[PDB]
Write a protein that binds this DNA or RNA. Structure first.
Ligand SMILES: [Mg+2]
Ligand SMILES: [Mg+2]
Ligand SMILES: [Mg+2]
Ligand SMILES: [Zn+2]
Length: 592
RNA sequence: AGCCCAGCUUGGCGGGCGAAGGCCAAGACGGAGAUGAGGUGCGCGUGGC
DNA sequence: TGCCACGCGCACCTCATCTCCCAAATAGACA
DNA sequence: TGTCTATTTGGGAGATGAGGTGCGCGTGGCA
């Protein structure tokens, strides 16, 4: 029963966001901002509690001095790098910088120890501050829901999300990595939640309950026209799409104490099992190219799938090397031959034996992403030209009032986002001057290019993601066991730009290719499919695998020879591919 | 040429250029939140040139 | 066998991991 | 006065710590 899942329904594009929904999203954003402000104040108060002790104060002073020295040396290193116009500077500067950084790290560790020794004596004060924070959070519910128009489900969703975020931040800071809460800017996107409570001894919240007009949750969430998945899968796609158009009635908070409901015309492609247990739903609103889209996600608790027992073992390895037919994003090997559909044979390549292959991404995705980049360049150039023309007209002509104030060239000149120019075009749409035409002929055009720059991009990414899911599907259809390497793409991405031996532009191109390939997404999709379909997954400790030659079992030195393929070995004196060897070593390690 | 026209990806037919108008076929489908990174684009400085 | 340009400013996007997906007590609307 | 519906609430916990990142894992060809 534990297996959670989400079924999504796409609201009709000919549906305008009601005012109640907009107010609900605004209230949710304000509530999260208030929560973040409270959390930051609480953090500052805790740090003030820590700084009260004398030993911690002395450690803080030492750490501050060390940080000042480190930042000064970093500034000098940056200046020397700028002067030399390269990354090769005097070795003395690097040694001074390393020594300063080591001293700073030691001072920070000393501060941590000073906190640790006096940790037990501040427990009462920290508990008191935590109680004050909880009281303020309760007052937020009093203000936003008891005396406000925010639905209690949305408040609870936001509060739970925030508490999970602070738990994650504390866990990260415990390891030694930086993390902090940040203020986001509202734009019109958000989420509104509905919760289906089930008390002790209550009947399951099956999908058949939600379809009833007079059900237990008729005034919380109503999804009419539920069809059994077995019957649903027999119908033709025409009937499935005609019958899947329903009108979901959803609670949408209050308005001056008066509860309100919204009717979303949604299109449903799949239904939930008759034994599901709907735990809740959420309507998510997003802006893509300044256009609002809505989607209703319903969460259900379904039973688990019996694990598989037989099947070939498939080992997967991640890379982002470049090939004439696209980026080769993965390399897979199998213990027994696999069966790949013919429609995927150009993406999930296989060998004659059927036990090995490479997963590559079509070059059309990269071409479309490059097209989006070109569109962005053209948009920026046109925006700059418009800025120049508007500033000139403002200087040489009279300034009609904008935002109930005269327009000053200092403000217009420093405008950088296109949102300001779009707003000025809207306000002066009926201005009647000439700068109202020049400022509209731009905006209209920019409303067509912008969409493309976003829309096409999404398509490309979607295409890639789709293919990945397809690939994952086939593996879960046959594999009795799947092995994945423990490569951390995030750590590599974070540390790549600082210790690269290549020029900045080459590393930028490599990182862009890695981002477009998205190896981590492919691995995540494979793991998710295996988990859903009951296939076991094993994360292999992949340390020292590309430096090991499978045929001879010798470990080559890390002399950066692995920057190209094939790679020369020292034990046997032969050139070997470092990814076939990787997957072979993974299979050997697992099959032991 | 692109983007859009009942969820998403890929195709076919018929349309729209910020508005219109949808129909059909195959496939896959676990979402949200936060954080941390990365990338692109346009300007500026410094040089080499 | 050595080289490929080093830093800012803002604006606007995606990628990589990780967690979580409630229910009891109390109050109201109705007959 | 008694069934269902809707909202309020307390969780859920025991409670140090933020600036990574040299372990590998990935990624270079051109003159
Ligand atoms: Mg490899
Ligand atoms: Mg569509
Ligand atoms: Mg057409
Ligand atoms: Zn060898």
């Amino acid at each position: 029963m534990t297996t959670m899942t989400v079924h999504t329904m796409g609201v009709h594009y000919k549906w305008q966001i009601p005012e109640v929904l907009r107010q609900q999203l605004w209230l949710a954003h304000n509530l999260r901002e208030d929560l973040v402000s409270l959390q930051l104040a609480y953090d500052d108060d805790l740090k003030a509690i820590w700084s009260s002790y004398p030993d911690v104060a002395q450690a803080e002073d030492t750490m501050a001095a060390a940080e000042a020295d480190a930042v000064a040396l970093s500034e000098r290193v940056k200046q020397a790098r700028i002067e030399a116009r390269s990354k090769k500077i005097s070795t003395e500067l690097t040694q001074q910088l390393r020594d300063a950084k080591k001293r700073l790290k030691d001072a920070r560790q000393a501060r941590r120890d000073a906190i640790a020794v006096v940790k037990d004596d501040a427990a009462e004060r920290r508990k008191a501050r935590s109680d004050q924070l909880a009281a303020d959070q309760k007052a937020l519910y009093g203000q936003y829901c008891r005396d406000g128009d925010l639905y209690w489900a949305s408040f609870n969703t936001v509060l739970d999300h925030h508490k999970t975020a602070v738990k994650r931040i504390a866990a990260q800071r415990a390891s030694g990595k930086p993390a902090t809460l940040r203020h986001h800017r509202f734009d019109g996107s958000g989420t509104i939640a509905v919760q289906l409570q089930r008390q002790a001894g209550a009947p399951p919240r099956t999908p058949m309950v939600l379809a009833d007009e007079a059900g237990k949750y008729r005034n919380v969430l109503h999804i009419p026209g539920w069809t059994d998945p077995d019957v649903w899968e027999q119908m033709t796609r025409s009937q499935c799409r005609q019958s899947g158009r329903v009108t979901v009635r959803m609670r949408c908070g209050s308005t001056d104490g008066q509860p309100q409901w919204i009717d979303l015309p949604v299109q449903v492609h799949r239904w939930l099992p008759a034994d599901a247990d709907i735990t809740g739903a959420e309507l998510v609103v997003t802006r893509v190219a300044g256009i609002y889209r809505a989607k209703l996600c319903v969460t259900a608790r379904i039973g688990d799938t019996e694990p598989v027992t037989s099947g070939p073992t498939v080992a997967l390895h991640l890379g982002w090397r470049s090939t004439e037919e696209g980026t080769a994003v993965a390399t897979w090997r199998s213990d027994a031959p696999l069966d790949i559909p013919f429609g995927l044979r150009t993406v999930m390549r296989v060998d004659a034996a059927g036990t090995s292959g490479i997963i590559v991404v079509p070059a059309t995705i990269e071409r479309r992403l490059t097209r989006t980049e070109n569109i962005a360049s053209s948009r920026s150039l046109a925006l700059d030209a418009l800025r120049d023309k508007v500033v000139g007209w403002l200087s040489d002509n009279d300034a009609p009032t904008y935002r109930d104030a005269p327009l000053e060239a200092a403000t217009v000149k420093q405008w950088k986002s296109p949102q300001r120019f779009a707003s000025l075009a809207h306000a002066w749409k009926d201005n009647g001057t000439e700068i109202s035409d020049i400022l509209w002929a731009w905006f209209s055009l920019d409303r067509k290019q912008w969409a493309q720059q976003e829309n096409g991009r999404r398509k490309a990414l979607g295409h890639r993601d789709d293919l990945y899911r397809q690939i994952a599907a086939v593996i879960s259809d046959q594999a009795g066991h799947v092995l994945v390497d423990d490569t951390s793409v995030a750590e590599l991405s974070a540390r790549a730009m600082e210790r690269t031996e290549l020029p900045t532009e080459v590393q930028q191109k490599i990182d862009r290719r890695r981002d477009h390939a998205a190896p981590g997404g492919l691995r995540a999709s494979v793991v998710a499919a295996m988990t859903r379909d009951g296939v076991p997954v094993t994360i292999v400790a992949a340390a020292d695998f590309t430096r090991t030659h499978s045929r001879c079992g010798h470990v080559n030195p890390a002399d950066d020879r692995y920057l190209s393929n094939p790679v020369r070995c020292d034990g046997c004196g032969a050139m070997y591919d470092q990814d076939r060897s990787f997957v072979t070593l993974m299979l050997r390690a697992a099959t032991a």
